[PDB]
Ligand SMILES: OC[C@H]1O[C@H](O[C@H]2[C@@H](O)[C@H](O)[C@@H](CO)O[C@@H]2O)[C@@H](O)[C@@H](O)[C@@H]1O
């Protein structure tokens with residue numbers, strides 16, 4: 001709606017769907033991982049208020065991506081894996097216009113990659129349960 | 143503009159179709175790998191056809207009917223005769239999925255479009271289709 005562009009999600013069909021929408025300003029992403037991607041904390045600002053939403057389960061070790069001034073997410077990549085009978089994100093990483101982060105997680109499977117030649121990530125959607133079943137992104141120019 | 147990809151290698155020469163008003167059809171030329179693509183589309187009142195990549199292989203045409211649009215692209219980036227090229231390519235419309243076109247396996251990629259559509263292409267081509275990316279636009 002309202003001219004959104006959503007690509008993905010990559011991953012499985014388990015868990016519960018989530019959708020952050022594209023209205024907020026992402027300030028940091030915290031990926032929790034061990035053998036696979038357990039979940040993600042997305043911290044954003046909106047009208048001067050800072051909020052964090054958690055998706056996926058409670059396991060794993062955190063790996064934070066803190067966006068500096070003038071830093072944007074311009075890529076996402078990873079692996080879709082079969083783990084404990086579930087189709088989940090086995091690995092997940094991101095690129096900014098300054099640096100590559102990760103991938104985080106240690107289970108291979110079917111790779112995916114989202115290089116963004118023109119544009120940036122402006123929000124997330126996906127599925128979460130005990131682990132991070134799936135992830136997708138909203139895109140916008142620059 | 144929103145441009146995602148390209149997926150593929152760094153050989154050949156760059157191409158850029160830019161976005162279209164409406165894509166009419168896409169022809170994927172393939173054999174062992176993806177040789178190239180034809181795109182027929184409307185543009186500021188004109189009907190146009192553009193060819194990218196080489197002229198080898200056999201064509202496979204996807205015609206987009208009334209109210210039909212491209213909502214996915216997937217394939218495999220393969221190693222072939224010392225080049226990194228598209229080994230397989232396929233597309234999904236809001237009605238059906240098509241492909242794979244090509245026969246050489248490699249590193250898979252996939253672009254499901256949950257909201258929006260493919261409106262044009264860019265990439266690299268030589269004898270084969272070295273790389274491919276897409277322009278994305280929202281749904282009307
Ligand atoms: O987030 C992954 C997965 O987690 C939970 O399911 C676990 C287990 O209870 C299931 O029996 C197996 C097989 O489906 O998968 C997991 O290990 C659920 O939240 C599930 O919906 C979700 O896909």
Ligand SMILES: OC[C@H]1O[C@H](O)[C@@H](O)[C@@H](O)[C@@H]1O
Nearest residue numbers: 033034035036037038059060
């Ligand atoms: O990633 C899945 C799982 O992997 C390991 O067993 C640990 O790192 C856990 O904390 C984590 O939940």
Ligand SMILES: OC[C@H]1O[C@H](O)[C@@H](O)[C@@H](O)[C@@H]1O
Nearest residue numbers: 172173174175176177198199
């Ligand atoms: O796809 C690469 C190549 O594969 C085969 O050798 C034939 O189908 C050719 O015409 C084609 O050019």
Ligand SMILES: OC[C@H]1O[C@H](O)[C@@H](O)[C@@H](O)[C@@H]1O
Nearest residue numbers: 153154225267268269270272
């Ligand atoms: O397209 C595959 C291959 O075709 C030709 O040999 C050249 O144009 C290369 O640069 C290119 O990589």
